[PDB]
Amino acid sequence: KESERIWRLQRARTILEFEKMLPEWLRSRFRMGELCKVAEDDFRLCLRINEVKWTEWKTHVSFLNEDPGP
Amino acid sequence: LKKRIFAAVSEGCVEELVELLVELQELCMHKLTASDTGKTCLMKALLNINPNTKEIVRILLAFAEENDILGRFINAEYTEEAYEGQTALNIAIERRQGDIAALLIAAGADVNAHAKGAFFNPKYQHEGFYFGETPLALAACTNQPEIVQLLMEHEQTDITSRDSRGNNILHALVTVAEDFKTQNDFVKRMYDMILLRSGNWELETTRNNDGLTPLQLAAKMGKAEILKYILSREIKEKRLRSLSRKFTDWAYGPVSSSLYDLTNVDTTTDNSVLEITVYNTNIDNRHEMLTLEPLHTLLHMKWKKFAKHMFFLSFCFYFFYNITLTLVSYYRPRGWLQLLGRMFVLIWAMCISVKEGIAIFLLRPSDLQSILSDAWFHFVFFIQAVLVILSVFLYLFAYKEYLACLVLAMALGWANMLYYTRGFQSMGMYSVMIQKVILHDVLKFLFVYIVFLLGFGVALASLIEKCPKDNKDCSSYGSFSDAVLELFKLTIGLGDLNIQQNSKYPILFLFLLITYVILTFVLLLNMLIALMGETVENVSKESERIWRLQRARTILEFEKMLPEWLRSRFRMGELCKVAEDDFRLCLRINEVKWTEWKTHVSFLNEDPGP
Ligand SMILES: CCCCCCCC/C=C/CCCCCCCC(=O)O[C@@H](COC(=O)CCCCCCCCCCCCCCC)COP(=O)([O-])OCC[N+](C)(C)C
Numbered sequence: 001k002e003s004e005r006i007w008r009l010q011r012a013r014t015i016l017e018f019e020k021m022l023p024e025w026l027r028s029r030f031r032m033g034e035l036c037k038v039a040e041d042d043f044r045l046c047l048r049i050n051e052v053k054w055t056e057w058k059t060h061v062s063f064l065n066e067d068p069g070p
Numbered sequence: 071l072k073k074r075i076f077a078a079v080s081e082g083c084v085e086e087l088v089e090l091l092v093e094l095q096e097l098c099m100h101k102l103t104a105s106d107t108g109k110t111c112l113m114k115a116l117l118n119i120n121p122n123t124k125e126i127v128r129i130l131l132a133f134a135e136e137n138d139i140l141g142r143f144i145n146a147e148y149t150e151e152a153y154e155g156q157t158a159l160n161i162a163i164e165r166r167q168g169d170i171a172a173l174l175i176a177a178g179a180d181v182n183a184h185a186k187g188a189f190f191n192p193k194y195q196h197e198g199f200y201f202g203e204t205p206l207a208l209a210a211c212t213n214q215p216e217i218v219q220l221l222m223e224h225e226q227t228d229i230t231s232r233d234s235r236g237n238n239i240l241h242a243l244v245t246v247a248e249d250f251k252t253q254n255d256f257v258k259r260m261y262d263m264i265l266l267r268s269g270n271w272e273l274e275t276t277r278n279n280d281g282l283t284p285l286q287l288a289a290k291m292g293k294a295e296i297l298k299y300i301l302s303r304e305i306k307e308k309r310l311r312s313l314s315r316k317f318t319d320w321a322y323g324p325v326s327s328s329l330y331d332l333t334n335v336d337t338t339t340d341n342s343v344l345e346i347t348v349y350n351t352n353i354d355n356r357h358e359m360l361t362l363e364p365l366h367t368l369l370h371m372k373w374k375k376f377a378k379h380m381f382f383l384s385f386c387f388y389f390f391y392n393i394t395l396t397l398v399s400y401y402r403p404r405g406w407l408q409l410l411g412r413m414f415v416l417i418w419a420m421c422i423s424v425k426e427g428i429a430i431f432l433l434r435p436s437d438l439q440s441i442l443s444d445a446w447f448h449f450v451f452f453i454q455a456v457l458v459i460l461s462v463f464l465y466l467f468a469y470k471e472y473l474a475c476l477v478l479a480m481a482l483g484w485a486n487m488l489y490y491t492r493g494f495q496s497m498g499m500y501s502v503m504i505q506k507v508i509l510h511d512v513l514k515f516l517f518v519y520i521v522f523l524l525g526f527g528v529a530l531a532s533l534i535e536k537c538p539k540d541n542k543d544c545s546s547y548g549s550f551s552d553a554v555l556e557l558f559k560l561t562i563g564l565g566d567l568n569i570q571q572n573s574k575y576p577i578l579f580l581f582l583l584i585t586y587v588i589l590t591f592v593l594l595l596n597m598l599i600a601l602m603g604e605t606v607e608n609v610s611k612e613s614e615r616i617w618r619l620q621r622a623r624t625i626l627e628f629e630k631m632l633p634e635w636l637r638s639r640f641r642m643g644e645l646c647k648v649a650e651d652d653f654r655l656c657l658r659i660n661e662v663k664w665t666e667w668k669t670h671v672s673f674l675n676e677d678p679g680p
Pocket residue numbers: 516519551552554555558561562
């Protein structure tokens with residue numbers, strides 16, 4: 001059971017080492033988009049993650065965009 | 071003016087809306103409608119839920135009633151490509167606003183509106199949510215029973231509506247169904263409630279755009295809970311009892327005999343539930359779906375009727391074919407009465423070759439996935455057959471390379487005889503555990519061992535100089551192949567360890583030899599023994615099922631091998647229920663349980679037993 005993690009730790013170390021091996025250019029492969037929140041300035045970065053769960057069943061009020069999807 | 075009234079409904083203002091509406095009405099119908107996506111102001115306020123949403127919705131509906139335009143207001147669809155049929159009722163039902171949905175429906179909302187947008191019909195199940203493309207289907211899939219019951223009894227609701235995929239509400243409930251861990255059992259309850267309220271068989275006999283009923287769709291998609299409910303569906307009330315699939319013929323004490331319907335379950339109606347459950351491969355819960363009441367019993371009776379004799383005959387014929395092939399190949403000249411053996415070898419090899427050829431030609435590329443757990447024996451039987459064919463093909467002419475194919479055919483044929491061990495239980499577990507072991511950790515050990523063997527073999531072969539004059543047996547690690555063979559002989563424990571080779575650095579030679587000894591004999595082999603203990607520990611419990619899956623596959627294949635006649639060995643009887651016509655089939659199953667202790671009312675026959 002203690003093998004799906006340590007291997008992923010080694011994989012993460014290799015990923016970060018390979019990213020550090022990249023020069024000052026060619027590193028312009030950031031995560032996702034620019035618009036993050038309602039702040040008028042310095043939106044910084046964001047990372048879209050989709051989650052599915054059939055147990056809450058509540059009205060969505062903290063939503064940000066009326067149109068789902070792209 | 072449009073933006074002022076569109077940005078105010080989100081915040082839910084009850085006093086600014088009337089002031090913004092009186093001047094809008096007195097300005098003049100194409101006023102409260104977005105020109106890009108068709109987002110009408112009525113449904114605009116539904117996504118932004120505020121405590122004053124109900125009030126402003128009522129004011130909007132009253133204003134629409136007072137200016138004699140309501141049809142285009144409440145039955146307003148979208149315009150975007152991603153949303154082709156989303157309406158006010160759809161988003162109101164999703165927001166769990168039963169009162170708002172009731173107000174819209176009572177005002178003349180489009181109940182049979184289809185949300186046929188691309189977002190509503192996803193392809194990767196990550197960027198969309200499929201519910202049935204119907205407000206009623208959405209209410210059923212989102213665990214909103216009050217909205218469903220409010221929707222069924224209406225003057226224009228179409229329960230039997232089919233969306234762009236051909237699915238209906240029962241199909242959609244089957245697709246959105248899942249196990250008890252991820253979601254609750256509300257889908258089965260919704261399926262039961264909607265089916266009982268409809269009160270007809272047209273919902274479960276309607277095929278979508280795939281040639282599948284909701285029962286067959288539940289069998290294909292892997293929904294074991296919904297299939298368990300439908301297969302053993304018993305309805306106590308007499309007003310609609312033809313909708314049941316299980317009928318209790320009699321129940322005397324803690325002994326009850328139930329009749330199970332076998333309309334599309336038994337493998338006699340092309341695409342059946344049993345064939346779909348067994349033959350398909352793109353599911354993980356295949357083992358638990360075959361444990362249901364009708365399918366298990368049907369497989370048992372099929373095995374005890376015709377599949378046992380067919381499997382025994384196939385075993386005997388292949389055993390005799392392998393025996394006579396071995397006898398005519400080992401006793402080669404290097405015979406009129408002995409010509410029958412080789413002629414039978416040729417005939418049976420051709421029969422196996424054509425059988426595997428027609429079984430590979432229609433073989434899907436989906437069961438070829440995983441790791442060769444359901445099609446490997448087909449390939450090796452075909453390879454053995456064509457090896458015998460090629461052996462006699464080269465034996466007919468003057469080809470010296472004919473004994474290699476024949477010997478390989480003997481070895482493969484005697485190796486292929488372990489397939490028939492699945493007829494018995496314990497040997498079946500042994501065979502499937504051979505399968506998992508030889509693919510899980512034997513391959514990894516072989517890969518690592520070959521890397522070490524070739525690396526150390528080429529490292530040792532470079533440490534020995536050429537032999538002197540009149541000498542050829544100076545060192546056993548002469549070439550790369552010789553060093554590899556010596557390391558392989560050392561690994562299996564054969565031969566004698568000689569360290570007096572013609573190496574210019576004998577200390578380094580011994581160091582590399584001892585390093586190979588440790589890495590292979592101490593580390594790799596013993597860790598392999600330790601690893602396959604974990605493997606046989608995990609597959610210890612996962613062996614009573616996979617073997618039964620292989621047995622069910624053999625039973626269904628043997629039944630398909632039967633001709634159009636001789637297949638008249640159906641399950642049990644004809645009388646199934648009280649229906650006056652088309653009794654179809656039945657399957658008597660007796661159950662014993664000493665915990666209910668209830669009066670039997672759903673009984674069918676007063677006299678128990680035969
Ligand atoms: C823990 C350890 C256990 C084993 C682990 C594995 C160890 C593997 C290691 C094996 C190496 C062993 C020594 C190799 C031979 C060297 C000498 C030699 O004859 O060289 C020959 C090459 O020889 C070959 O190519 C041999 C045949 C293939 C070897 C691999 C078989 C794998 C079978 C796997 C089956 C599937 C798996 C089975 C289960 C599903 C050269 O030919 P020759 O004969 O010198 O003469 C030339 C002929 N001529 C004159 C006509 C031109």
